[PDB]
PDB file of all heavy atoms in Angstrom:
ATOM      1  N   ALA A   1       0.880  -1.228   0.008  1.00 37.23           N
ATOM      2  CA  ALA A   1       0.017  -0.041   0.050  1.00 37.23           C
ATOM      3  C   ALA A   1       0.849   1.212  -0.085  1.00 37.23           C
ATOM      4  O   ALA A   1       0.491   2.191  -0.660  1.00 37.23           O
ATOM      5  CB  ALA A   1      -0.889  -0.099   1.190  1.00 37.23           C
ATOM      6  N   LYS A   2       2.018   1.202   0.882  1.00 37.54           N
ATOM      7  CA  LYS A   2       2.898   2.317   0.797  1.00 37.54           C
ATOM      8  C   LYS A   2       3.347   2.719  -0.577  1.00 37.54           C
ATOM      9  O   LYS A   2       3.490   3.767  -0.944  1.00 37.54           O
ATOM     10  CB  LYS A   2       3.862   2.175   1.845  1.00 37.54           C
ATOM     11  CG  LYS A   2       3.395   2.487   3.289  1.00 37.54           C
ATOM     12  CD  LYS A   2       4.300   1.908   4.388  1.00 37.54           C
ATOM     13  CE  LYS A   2       4.962   0.647   4.425  1.00 37.54           C
ATOM     14  NZ  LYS A   2       5.991  -0.021   5.409  1.00 37.54           N
ATOM     15  N   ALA A   3       3.773   1.621  -1.317  1.00 38.04           N
ATOM     16  CA  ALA A   3       4.283   1.734  -2.703  1.00 38.04           C
ATOM     17  C   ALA A   3       3.150   2.516  -3.543  1.00 38.04           C
ATOM     18  O   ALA A   3       3.536   3.531  -4.254  1.00 38.04           O
ATOM     19  CB  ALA A   3       4.545   0.444  -3.270  1.00 38.04           C
ATOM     20  N   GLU A   4       1.895   1.937  -3.516  1.00 36.53           N
ATOM     21  CA  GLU A   4       0.936   2.617  -4.367  1.00 36.53           C
ATOM     22  C   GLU A   4       0.678   3.995  -4.007  1.00 36.53           C
ATOM     23  O   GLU A   4       0.473   4.846  -4.891  1.00 36.53           O
ATOM     24  CB  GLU A   4      -0.410   1.780  -4.287  1.00 36.53           C
ATOM     25  CG  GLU A   4      -0.263   0.349  -4.520  1.00 36.53           C
ATOM     26  CD  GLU A   4       0.144   0.059  -5.939  1.00 36.53           C
ATOM     27  OE1 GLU A   4      -0.476   0.624  -6.945  1.00 36.53           O
ATOM     28  OE2 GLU A   4       1.015  -0.718  -6.213  1.00 36.53           O
ATOM     29  N   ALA A   5       0.772   4.426  -2.627  1.00 37.39           N
ATOM     30  CA  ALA A   5       0.512   5.687  -2.310  1.00 37.39           C
ATOM     31  C   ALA A   5       1.527   6.667  -2.818  1.00 37.39           C
ATOM     32  O   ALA A   5       1.219   7.711  -3.453  1.00 37.39           O
ATOM     33  CB  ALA A   5       0.565   5.776  -0.676  1.00 37.39           C
ATOM     34  N   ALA A   6       2.748   6.258  -2.680  1.00 39.85           N
ATOM     35  CA  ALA A   6       3.858   7.139  -3.275  1.00 39.85           C
ATOM     36  C   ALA A   6       3.592   7.369  -4.764  1.00 39.85           C
ATOM     37  O   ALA A   6       3.876   8.436  -5.311  1.00 39.85           O
ATOM     38  CB  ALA A   6       5.301   6.440  -3.124  1.00 39.85           C
ATOM     39  N   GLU A   7       3.192   6.351  -5.478  1.00 37.22           N
ATOM     40  CA  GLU A   7       3.100   6.297  -6.894  1.00 37.22           C
ATOM     41  C   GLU A   7       1.918   7.213  -7.355  1.00 37.22           C
ATOM     42  O   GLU A   7       1.945   7.885  -8.364  1.00 37.22           O
ATOM     43  CB  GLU A   7       3.060   4.908  -7.455  1.00 37.22           C
ATOM     44  CG  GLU A   7       3.106   4.859  -8.916  1.00 37.22           C
ATOM     45  CD  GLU A   7       4.217   4.028  -9.501  1.00 37.22           C
ATOM     46  OE1 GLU A   7       4.349   2.880  -9.497  1.00 37.22           O
ATOM     47  OE2 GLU A   7       5.274   4.758  -9.776  1.00 37.22           O
ATOM     48  N   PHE A   8       0.923   7.164  -6.615  1.00 39.95           N
ATOM     49  CA  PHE A   8      -0.122   8.142  -6.936  1.00 39.95           C
ATOM     50  C   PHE A   8       0.121   9.529  -6.700  1.00 39.95           C
ATOM     51  O   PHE A   8      -0.039  10.292  -7.697  1.00 39.95           O
ATOM     52  CB  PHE A   8      -1.427   7.778  -5.920  1.00 39.95           C
ATOM     53  CG  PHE A   8      -2.697   8.267  -6.464  1.00 39.95           C
ATOM     54  CD1 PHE A   8      -3.594   7.538  -7.415  1.00 39.95           C
ATOM     55  CD2 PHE A   8      -3.232   9.559  -6.179  1.00 39.95           C
ATOM     56  CE1 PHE A   8      -4.692   7.997  -7.781  1.00 39.95           C
ATOM     57  CE2 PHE A   8      -4.339   9.998  -6.673  1.00 39.95           C
ATOM     58  CZ  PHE A   8      -5.159   9.198  -7.448  1.00 39.95           C
ATOM     59  N   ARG A   9       0.760   9.951  -5.571  1.00 39.49           N
ATOM     60  CA  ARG A   9       1.183  11.257  -5.370  1.00 39.49           C
ATOM     61  C   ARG A   9       2.202  11.564  -6.575  1.00 39.49           C
ATOM     62  O   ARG A   9       2.094  12.807  -7.138  1.00 39.49           O
ATOM     63  CB  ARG A   9       1.947  11.367  -4.112  1.00 39.49           C
ATOM     64  CG  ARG A   9       2.612  12.827  -3.744  1.00 39.49           C
ATOM     65  CD  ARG A   9       1.543  13.911  -3.763  1.00 39.49           C
ATOM     66  NE  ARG A   9       2.304  15.126  -3.475  1.00 39.49           N
ATOM     67  CZ  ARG A   9       2.129  16.386  -4.035  1.00 39.49           C
ATOM     68  NH1 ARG A   9       1.179  16.499  -4.825  1.00 39.49           N
ATOM     69  NH2 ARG A   9       2.766  17.342  -3.681  1.00 39.49           N
ATOM     70  N   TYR A  10       2.971  10.653  -6.996  1.00 40.44           N
ATOM     71  CA  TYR A  10       3.834  11.069  -8.167  1.00 40.44           C
ATOM     72  C   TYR A  10       3.218  11.363  -9.488  1.00 40.44           C
ATOM     73  O   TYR A  10       3.563  12.249 -10.040  1.00 40.44           O
ATOM     74  CB  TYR A  10       4.987   9.883  -8.227  1.00 40.44           C
ATOM     75  CG  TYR A  10       5.990  10.236  -9.234  1.00 40.44           C
ATOM     76  CD1 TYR A  10       6.808  11.215  -9.147  1.00 40.44           C
ATOM     77  CD2 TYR A  10       6.171   9.499 -10.438  1.00 40.44           C
ATOM     78  CE1 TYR A  10       7.815  11.581  -9.939  1.00 40.44           C
ATOM     79  CE2 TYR A  10       7.087   9.835 -11.465  1.00 40.44           C
ATOM     80  CZ  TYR A  10       7.831  10.868 -11.230  1.00 40.44           C
ATOM     81  OH  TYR A  10       8.945  11.154 -12.219  1.00 40.44           O
ATOM     82  N   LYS A  11       2.301  10.510  -9.715  1.00 42.08           N
ATOM     83  CA  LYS A  11       1.630  10.506 -11.089  1.00 42.08           C
ATOM     84  C   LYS A  11       0.410  11.613 -11.258  1.00 42.08           C
ATOM     85  O   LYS A  11       0.206  12.001 -12.332  1.00 42.08           O
ATOM     86  CB  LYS A  11       1.215   9.309 -11.634  1.00 42.08           C
ATOM     87  CG  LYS A  11       2.367   8.282 -11.873  1.00 42.08           C
ATOM     88  CD  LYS A  11       1.829   6.903 -12.191  1.00 42.08           C
ATOM     89  CE  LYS A  11       1.318   6.871 -13.535  1.00 42.08           C
ATOM     90  NZ  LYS A  11       2.218   6.871 -14.604  1.00 42.08           N
ATOM     91  N   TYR A  12      -0.141  11.965 -10.185  1.00 37.97           N
ATOM     92  CA  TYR A  12      -1.295  12.706 -10.352  1.00 37.97           C
ATOM     93  C   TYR A  12      -1.200  14.071  -9.458  1.00 37.97           C
ATOM     94  O   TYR A  12      -2.119  14.984  -9.757  1.00 37.97           O
ATOM     95  CB  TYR A  12      -2.572  12.118  -9.816  1.00 37.97           C
ATOM     96  CG  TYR A  12      -2.741  10.800 -10.684  1.00 37.97           C
ATOM     97  CD1 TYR A  12      -2.414   9.469 -10.243  1.00 37.97           C
ATOM     98  CD2 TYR A  12      -3.326  10.912 -11.982  1.00 37.97           C
ATOM     99  CE1 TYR A  12      -2.477   8.413 -11.011  1.00 37.97           C
ATOM    100  CE2 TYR A  12      -3.405   9.854 -12.778  1.00 37.97           C
ATOM    101  CZ  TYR A  12      -3.082   8.572 -12.314  1.00 37.97           C
ATOM    102  OH  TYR A  12      -3.239   7.539 -13.083  1.00 37.97           O
ATOM    103  N   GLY A  13      -0.274  14.143  -8.712  1.00 37.32           N
ATOM    104  CA  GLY A  13      -0.014  15.443  -8.093  1.00 37.32           C
ATOM    105  C   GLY A  13      -0.744  15.864  -6.885  1.00 37.32           C
ATOM    106  O   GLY A  13      -0.759  17.072  -6.466  1.00 37.32           O
ATOM    107  N   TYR A  14      -1.554  14.898  -6.310  1.00 37.10           N
ATOM    108  CA  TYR A  14      -2.126  15.160  -4.958  1.00 37.10           C
ATOM    109  C   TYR A  14      -2.125  13.801  -4.403  1.00 37.10           C
ATOM    110  O   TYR A  14      -2.264  12.638  -4.974  1.00 37.10           O
ATOM    111  CB  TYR A  14      -3.527  15.734  -5.208  1.00 37.10           C
ATOM    112  CG  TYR A  14      -4.478  14.894  -5.899  1.00 37.10           C
ATOM    113  CD1 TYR A  14      -5.304  14.041  -5.165  1.00 37.10           C
ATOM    114  CD2 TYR A  14      -4.573  14.988  -7.208  1.00 37.10           C
ATOM    115  CE1 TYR A  14      -6.282  13.276  -5.936  1.00 37.10           C
ATOM    116  CE2 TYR A  14      -5.635  14.234  -7.895  1.00 37.10           C
ATOM    117  CZ  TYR A  14      -6.456  13.313  -7.216  1.00 37.10           C
ATOM    118  OH  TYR A  14      -7.327  12.663  -7.796  1.00 37.10           O
ATOM    119  N   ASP A  15      -2.148  13.825  -2.984  1.00 34.88           N
ATOM    120  CA  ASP A  15      -2.141  12.630  -2.112  1.00 34.88           C
ATOM    121  C   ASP A  15      -3.336  11.703  -2.531  1.00 34.88           C
ATOM    122  O   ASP A  15      -4.289  12.024  -3.078  1.00 34.88           O
ATOM    123  CB  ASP A  15      -2.253  12.975  -0.655  1.00 34.88           C
ATOM    124  CG  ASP A  15      -2.014  11.739   0.205  1.00 34.88           C
ATOM    125  OD1 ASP A  15      -2.923  10.862   0.248  1.00 34.88           O
ATOM    126  OD2 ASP A  15      -0.946  11.671   0.900  1.00 34.88           O
ATOM    127  N   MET A  16      -3.084  10.399  -2.354  1.00 33.54           N
ATOM    128  CA  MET A  16      -3.946   9.312  -2.740  1.00 33.54           C
ATOM    129  C   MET A  16      -5.256   9.380  -1.873  1.00 33.54           C
ATOM    130  O   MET A  16      -5.271   9.565  -0.687  1.00 33.54           O
ATOM    131  CB  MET A  16      -3.344   7.952  -2.463  1.00 33.54           C
ATOM    132  CG  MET A  16      -4.055   6.861  -3.273  1.00 33.54           C
ATOM    133  SD  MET A  16      -2.979   5.432  -3.181  1.00 33.54           S
ATOM    134  CE  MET A  16      -3.757   4.479  -4.479  1.00 33.54           C
ATOM    135  N   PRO A  17      -6.373   9.470  -2.612  1.00 34.04           N
ATOM    136  CA  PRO A  17      -7.695   9.235  -1.713  1.00 34.04           C
ATOM    137  C   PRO A  17      -7.882   7.805  -1.265  1.00 34.04           C
ATOM    138  O   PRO A  17      -7.362   6.891  -1.810  1.00 34.04           O
ATOM    139  CB  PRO A  17      -8.674   9.507  -2.800  1.00 34.04           C
ATOM    140  CG  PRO A  17      -8.096  10.475  -3.860  1.00 34.04           C
ATOM    141  CD  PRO A  17      -6.649   9.765  -3.947  1.00 34.04           C
ATOM    142  N   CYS A  18      -8.576   7.619  -0.158  1.00 35.26           N
ATOM    143  CA  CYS A  18      -8.619   6.386   0.496  1.00 35.26           C
ATOM    144  C   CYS A  18      -9.589   5.413  -0.474  1.00 35.26           C
ATOM    145  O   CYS A  18      -9.176   4.274  -0.430  1.00 35.26           O
ATOM    146  CB  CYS A  18      -9.492   6.584   1.819  1.00 35.26           C
ATOM    147  SG  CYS A  18      -9.630   5.065   2.839  1.00 35.26           S
ATOM    148  N   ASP A  19     -10.525   5.979  -1.104  1.00 35.69           N
ATOM    149  CA  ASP A  19     -11.312   5.173  -1.908  1.00 35.69           C
ATOM    150  C   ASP A  19     -10.393   4.546  -3.057  1.00 35.69           C
ATOM    151  O   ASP A  19     -10.541   3.466  -3.377  1.00 35.69           O
ATOM    152  CB  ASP A  19     -12.395   6.201  -2.705  1.00 35.69           C
ATOM    153  CG  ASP A  19     -13.397   5.453  -3.478  1.00 35.69           C
ATOM    154  OD1 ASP A  19     -14.211   4.693  -2.916  1.00 35.69           O
ATOM    155  OD2 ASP A  19     -13.364   5.622  -4.723  1.00 35.69           O
ATOM    156  N   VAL A  20      -9.601   5.409  -3.698  1.00 38.66           N
ATOM    157  CA  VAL A  20      -8.775   4.816  -4.662  1.00 38.66           C
ATOM    158  C   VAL A  20      -7.769   3.740  -4.217  1.00 38.66           C
ATOM    159  O   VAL A  20      -7.546   2.795  -4.889  1.00 38.66           O
ATOM    160  CB  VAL A  20      -7.948   5.953  -5.316  1.00 38.66           C
ATOM    161  CG1 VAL A  20      -7.092   5.552  -6.515  1.00 38.66           C
ATOM    162  CG2 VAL A  20      -8.680   7.113  -5.677  1.00 38.66           C
ATOM    163  N   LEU A  21      -7.284   3.905  -2.910  1.00 36.79           N
ATOM    164  CA  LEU A  21      -6.504   2.887  -2.438  1.00 36.79           C
ATOM    165  C   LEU A  21      -7.215   1.710  -2.111  1.00 36.79           C
ATOM    166  O   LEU A  21      -6.804   0.522  -2.288  1.00 36.79           O
ATOM    167  CB  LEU A  21      -5.911   3.387  -1.096  1.00 36.79           C
ATOM    168  CG  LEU A  21      -4.879   2.561  -0.250  1.00 36.79           C
ATOM    169  CD1 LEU A  21      -3.708   2.346  -1.235  1.00 36.79           C
ATOM    170  CD2 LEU A  21      -4.405   3.236   1.037  1.00 36.79           C
ATOM    171  N   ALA A  22      -8.523   1.691  -1.566  1.00 37.94           N
ATOM    172  CA  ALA A  22      -9.404   0.574  -1.383  1.00 37.94           C
ATOM    173  C   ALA A  22      -9.382  -0.138  -2.626  1.00 37.94           C
ATOM    174  O   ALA A  22      -9.176  -1.380  -2.691  1.00 37.94           O
ATOM    175  CB  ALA A  22     -10.737   0.993  -0.931  1.00 37.94           C
ATOM    176  N   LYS A  23      -9.688   0.420  -3.807  1.00 39.81           N
ATOM    177  CA  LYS A  23      -9.859  -0.208  -5.020  1.00 39.81           C
ATOM    178  C   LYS A  23      -8.572  -0.803  -5.548  1.00 39.81           C
ATOM    179  O   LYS A  23      -8.589  -1.876  -6.246  1.00 39.81           O
ATOM    180  CB  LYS A  23     -10.509   0.604  -6.053  1.00 39.81           C
ATOM    181  CG  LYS A  23     -10.703   0.032  -7.410  1.00 39.81           C
ATOM    182  CD  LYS A  23     -10.306   0.930  -8.462  1.00 39.81           C
ATOM    183  CE  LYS A  23     -11.372   1.761  -8.711  1.00 39.81           C
ATOM    184  NZ  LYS A  23     -11.173   3.021  -9.453  1.00 39.81           N
ATOM    185  N   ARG A  24      -7.504  -0.070  -5.498  1.00 36.32           N
ATOM    186  CA  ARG A  24      -6.184  -0.452  -5.962  1.00 36.32           C
ATOM    187  C   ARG A  24      -5.774  -1.922  -5.314  1.00 36.32           C
ATOM    188  O   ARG A  24      -5.475  -2.767  -6.013  1.00 36.32           O
ATOM    189  CB  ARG A  24      -5.200   0.448  -5.832  1.00 36.32           C
ATOM    190  CG  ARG A  24      -3.702   0.163  -6.297  1.00 36.32           C
ATOM    191  CD  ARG A  24      -3.655   0.153  -7.848  1.00 36.32           C
ATOM    192  NE  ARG A  24      -3.802   1.411  -8.390  1.00 36.32           N
ATOM    193  CZ  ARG A  24      -4.432   1.838  -9.509  1.00 36.32           C
ATOM    194  NH1 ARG A  24      -5.090   0.868 -10.142  1.00 36.32           N
ATOM    195  NH2 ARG A  24      -4.392   3.058  -9.938  1.00 36.32           N
ATOM    196  N   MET A  25      -5.939  -1.843  -3.917  1.00 35.05           N
ATOM    197  CA  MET A  25      -5.633  -3.050  -3.155  1.00 35.05           C
ATOM    198  C   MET A  25      -6.508  -4.129  -3.508  1.00 35.05           C
ATOM    199  O   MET A  25      -6.182  -5.407  -3.599  1.00 35.05           O
ATOM    200  CB  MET A  25      -5.600  -2.649  -1.646  1.00 35.05           C
ATOM    201  CG  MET A  25      -4.199  -2.302  -1.191  1.00 35.05           C
ATOM    202  SD  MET A  25      -3.094  -3.658  -0.883  1.00 35.05           S
ATOM    203  CE  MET A  25      -4.129  -4.751   0.074  1.00 35.05           C
ATOM    204  N   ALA A  26      -7.783  -3.779  -3.799  1.00 36.12           N
ATOM    205  CA  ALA A  26      -8.801  -4.843  -4.095  1.00 36.12           C
ATOM    206  C   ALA A  26      -8.459  -5.544  -5.397  1.00 36.12           C
ATOM    207  O   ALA A  26      -8.603  -6.772  -5.521  1.00 36.12           O
ATOM    208  CB  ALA A  26     -10.141  -4.196  -4.224  1.00 36.12           C
ATOM    209  N   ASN A  27      -7.957  -4.738  -6.408  1.00 36.70           N
ATOM    210  CA  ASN A  27      -7.690  -5.426  -7.741  1.00 36.70           C
ATOM    211  C   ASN A  27      -6.462  -6.205  -7.640  1.00 36.70           C
ATOM    212  O   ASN A  27      -6.299  -7.376  -8.227  1.00 36.70           O
ATOM    213  CB  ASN A  27      -7.473  -4.327  -8.662  1.00 36.70           C
ATOM    214  CG  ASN A  27      -8.695  -3.506  -9.037  1.00 36.70           C
ATOM    215  OD1 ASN A  27      -9.755  -3.950  -8.503  1.00 36.70           O
ATOM    216  ND2 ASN A  27      -8.521  -2.493  -9.846  1.00 36.70           N
ATOM    217  N   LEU A  28      -5.474  -5.767  -6.837  1.00 34.35           N
ATOM    218  CA  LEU A  28      -4.279  -6.617  -6.554  1.00 34.35           C
ATOM    219  C   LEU A  28      -4.715  -7.897  -5.859  1.00 34.35           C
ATOM    220  O   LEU A  28      -4.237  -9.088  -6.271  1.00 34.35           O
ATOM    221  CB  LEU A  28      -3.265  -5.874  -5.644  1.00 34.35           C
ATOM    222  CG  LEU A  28      -2.728  -4.647  -6.344  1.00 34.35           C
ATOM    223  CD1 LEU A  28      -2.183  -3.687  -5.256  1.00 34.35           C
ATOM    224  CD2 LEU A  28      -1.733  -4.963  -7.376  1.00 34.35           C
ATOM    225  N   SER A  29      -5.678  -7.907  -4.852  1.00 33.38           N
ATOM    226  CA  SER A  29      -6.204  -9.109  -4.387  1.00 33.38           C
ATOM    227  C   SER A  29      -6.710  -9.968  -5.436  1.00 33.38           C
ATOM    228  O   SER A  29      -6.442 -11.164  -5.472  1.00 33.38           O
ATOM    229  CB  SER A  29      -7.298  -8.716  -3.313  1.00 33.38           C
ATOM    230  OG  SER A  29      -6.919  -7.477  -2.516  1.00 33.38           O
ATOM    231  N   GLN A  30      -7.554  -9.397  -6.286  1.00 36.10           N
ATOM    232  CA  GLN A  30      -8.148 -10.230  -7.390  1.00 36.10           C
ATOM    233  C   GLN A  30      -7.197 -10.944  -8.122  1.00 36.10           C
ATOM    234  O   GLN A  30      -7.234 -12.115  -8.557  1.00 36.10           O
ATOM    235  CB  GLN A  30      -9.077  -9.329  -8.324  1.00 36.10           C
ATOM    236  CG  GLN A  30     -10.123 -10.123  -9.136  1.00 36.10           C
ATOM    237  CD  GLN A  30      -9.472 -10.879 -10.210  1.00 36.10           C
ATOM    238  OE1 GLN A  30      -8.622 -10.410 -10.897  1.00 36.10           O
ATOM    239  NE2 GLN A  30     -10.057 -12.041 -10.451  1.00 36.10           N
ATOM    240  N   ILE A  31      -5.948 -10.306  -8.419  1.00 35.49           N
ATOM    241  CA  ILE A  31      -4.918 -11.006  -9.182  1.00 35.49           C
ATOM    242  C   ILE A  31      -4.333 -12.103  -8.369  1.00 35.49           C
ATOM    243  O   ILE A  31      -3.925 -13.177  -8.924  1.00 35.49           O
ATOM    244  CB  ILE A  31      -3.940  -9.858  -9.543  1.00 35.49           C
ATOM    245  CG1 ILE A  31      -4.710  -8.675 -10.183  1.00 35.49           C
ATOM    246  CG2 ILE A  31      -2.757 -10.458 -10.223  1.00 35.49           C
ATOM    247  CD1 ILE A  31      -4.486  -8.450 -11.751  1.00 35.49           C
ATOM    248  N   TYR A  32      -4.210 -11.928  -7.068  1.00 34.39           N
ATOM    249  CA  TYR A  32      -3.684 -13.083  -6.307  1.00 34.39           C
ATOM    250  C   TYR A  32      -4.620 -14.339  -6.337  1.00 34.39           C
ATOM    251  O   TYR A  32      -4.003 -15.463  -5.967  1.00 34.39           O
ATOM    252  CB  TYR A  32      -3.412 -12.746  -4.821  1.00 34.39           C
ATOM    253  CG  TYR A  32      -2.483 -11.467  -4.678  1.00 34.39           C
ATOM    254  CD1 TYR A  32      -2.685 -10.494  -3.681  1.00 34.39           C
ATOM    255  CD2 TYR A  32      -1.376 -11.250  -5.578  1.00 34.39           C
ATOM    256  CE1 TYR A  32      -1.913  -9.568  -3.613  1.00 34.39           C
ATOM    257  CE2 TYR A  32      -0.559 -10.201  -5.453  1.00 34.39           C
ATOM    258  CZ  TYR A  32      -0.870  -9.385  -4.410  1.00 34.39           C
ATOM    259  OH  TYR A  32       0.054  -8.241  -4.347  1.00 34.39           O
ATOM    260  N   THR A  33      -5.803 -14.244  -6.666  1.00 36.83           N
ATOM    261  CA  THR A  33      -6.782 -15.336  -6.640  1.00 36.83           C
ATOM    262  C   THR A  33      -7.150 -15.700  -8.111  1.00 36.83           C
ATOM    263  O   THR A  33      -8.166 -16.446  -8.411  1.00 36.83           O
ATOM    264  CB  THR A  33      -8.074 -15.020  -5.801  1.00 36.83           C
ATOM    265  OG1 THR A  33      -9.189 -15.181  -6.732  1.00 36.83           O
ATOM    266  CG2 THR A  33      -8.162 -13.688  -5.288  1.00 36.83           C
ATOM    267  N   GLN A  34      -6.361 -15.276  -9.133  1.00 39.52           N
ATOM    268  CA  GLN A  34      -6.581 -15.533 -10.474  1.00 39.52           C
ATOM    269  C   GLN A  34      -5.314 -16.168 -11.122  1.00 39.52           C
ATOM    270  O   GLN A  34      -5.358 -16.840 -12.000  1.00 39.52           O
ATOM    271  CB  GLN A  34      -7.029 -14.306 -11.304  1.00 39.52           C
ATOM    272  CG  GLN A  34      -7.295 -14.802 -12.826  1.00 39.52           C
ATOM    273  CD  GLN A  34      -7.814 -13.624 -13.578  1.00 39.52           C
ATOM    274  OE1 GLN A  34      -7.181 -12.759 -13.968  1.00 39.52           O
ATOM    275  NE2 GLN A  34      -9.255 -13.738 -13.758  1.00 39.52           N
ATOM    276  N   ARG A  35      -4.175 -15.968 -10.364  1.00 36.41           N
ATOM    277  CA  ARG A  35      -2.979 -16.701 -10.845  1.00 36.41           C
ATOM    278  C   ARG A  35      -2.838 -18.013 -10.056  1.00 36.41           C
ATOM    279  O   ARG A  35      -2.962 -17.933  -8.788  1.00 36.41           O
ATOM    280  CB  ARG A  35      -1.807 -15.734 -10.644  1.00 36.41           C
ATOM    281  CG  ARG A  35      -1.964 -14.388 -11.331  1.00 36.41           C
ATOM    282  CD  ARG A  35      -1.930 -14.416 -12.662  1.00 36.41           C
ATOM    283  NE  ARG A  35      -0.813 -15.251 -13.257  1.00 36.41           N
ATOM    284  CZ  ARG A  35      -0.679 -15.821 -14.375  1.00 36.41           C
ATOM    285  NH1 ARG A  35      -1.756 -15.746 -15.350  1.00 36.41           N
ATOM    286  NH2 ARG A  35       0.301 -16.584 -14.838  1.00 36.41           N
ATOM    287  N   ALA A  36      -2.429 -18.905 -10.729  1.00 37.71           N
ATOM    288  CA  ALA A  36      -2.307 -20.286 -10.191  1.00 37.71           C
ATOM    289  C   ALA A  36      -1.274 -20.625  -9.210  1.00 37.71           C
ATOM    290  O   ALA A  36      -1.232 -21.636  -8.547  1.00 37.71           O
ATOM    291  CB  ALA A  36      -2.421 -21.416 -11.293  1.00 37.71           C
ATOM    292  N   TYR A  37      -0.331 -19.577  -8.960  1.00 38.17           N
ATOM    293  CA  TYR A  37       0.682 -19.806  -8.057  1.00 38.17           C
ATOM    294  C   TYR A  37       0.953 -18.573  -7.211  1.00 38.17           C
ATOM    295  O   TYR A  37       2.031 -18.311  -6.770  1.00 38.17           O
ATOM    296  CB  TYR A  37       1.964 -20.076  -8.980  1.00 38.17           C
ATOM    297  CG  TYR A  37       2.301 -18.867  -9.827  1.00 38.17           C
ATOM    298  CD1 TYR A  37       3.506 -18.074  -9.764  1.00 38.17           C
ATOM    299  CD2 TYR A  37       1.563 -18.607 -11.053  1.00 38.17           C
ATOM    300  CE1 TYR A  37       3.800 -17.021 -10.472  1.00 38.17           C
ATOM    301  CE2 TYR A  37       1.884 -17.598 -11.740  1.00 38.17           C
ATOM    302  CZ  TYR A  37       2.951 -16.784 -11.596  1.00 38.17           C
ATOM    303  OH  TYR A  37       3.267 -15.879 -12.377  1.00 38.17           O
TER     304      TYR A  37
END
């Protein structure tokens, strides 16, 4: 999560919103349950 926060600030010019973080982490979760390893 800390990685994603830094990167949001970097690319969009304002601190990450909580909503956006919820969803980013959710999608990473989805990826952990779609890859077989």
Side-chain angles (χ1 to χ4, degrees):
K2 283 165 317 179
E4 307 292 313
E7 184 118 85
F8 198 89
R9 181 54 182 144
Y10 184 63
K11 292 172 73 72
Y12 299 99
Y14 63 93
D15 187 293
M16 197 171 201
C18 192
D19 188 66
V20 187
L21 184 57
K23 182 228 271 163
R24 181 71 70 220
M25 262 288 308
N27 295 356
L28 297 161
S29 317
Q30 202 283 321
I31 305 247
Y32 303 143
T33 125
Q34 184 167 80
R35 308 285 316 154
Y37 60 113

